[PDB]
Design a protein around this ligand. Structure first.
Ligand SMILES: [Ca+2]
Ligand SMILES: [Fe+3]
Ligand SMILES: [Fe+3]
Ligand SMILES: [Fe+3]
Ligand SMILES: [Fe+3]
Lengths: 125, 125
């Protein structure tokens, strides 16, 4: 695995992000975990592709162009902003708005969000 | 595993942070990965316990009260700030200063850092 990749065990639901990679395959419930490739699980561009807005002092990330549901069984678990050596993650819960603001100084950012049912998606500045 | 716990495979070096837990044991190189419990690997309080300074607009995290080495074979791989549903991580490389600033609005924070040789450490505001 590679730094910052997200892996999920399809059997039990564990999901991890790689902080230091280069080793063997991560395993869980006897099977290699699945690499959650961004946009890999064709869901709803309108509702899953993060929308990146530059605002005072940082960025407002909204998922998506159309608000994505935030229900008990279908919600955006987190929104992660990637920029110059940083990973800033806001974990969200059902009932929250599918948006996150991060105070960060950087003109180039990558935004990723993960939907419990729909998988991993990203967008770039 | 539990949300935000860090696991390392002692065999191959993979290190991951749990984003969604509650499943089976994470496995790598045929053995369950090791849970890197903060302050669990008694190293150097002076050099591993993060020092948390509140400054304009956020926090400056320094590892530690005495600067920790940042050499090719012994360095702080990242500094992570935990506060109200957020995980903000700055990944560091040899040659960098063992410090990180995060622009965040919150009076209660937890700072963790990971030293390649010394393991996982934290401190609270
Ligand atoms: Ca993070
Ligand atoms: Fe599993
Ligand atoms: Fe969805
Ligand atoms: Fe391994
Ligand atoms: Fe050390």
């Amino acid at each position: 695995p590679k730094h910052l990749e997200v892996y999920k065990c399809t059997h039990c639901g564990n999901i991890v992000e790689v902080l230091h990679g280069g080793g063997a395959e991560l395993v869980c419930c006897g099977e290699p975990m699945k690499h959650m490739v961004e946009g890999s699980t064709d869901g709803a561009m309108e509702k899953h592709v993060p929308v990146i807005e530059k605002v005072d002092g940082g960025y407002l990330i909204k998922v998506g162009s159309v608000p994505h549901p935030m229900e008990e069984k279908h919600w955006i678990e987190w929104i992660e902003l990637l920029a110059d050596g940083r990973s800033y993650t806001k974990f969200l819960k059902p009932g929250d708005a599918p948006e996150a603001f991060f105070a960060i100084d950087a003109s180039k950012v990558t935004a990723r969000e993960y939907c419990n049912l729909h998988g991993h998606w990203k967008a770039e500045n």
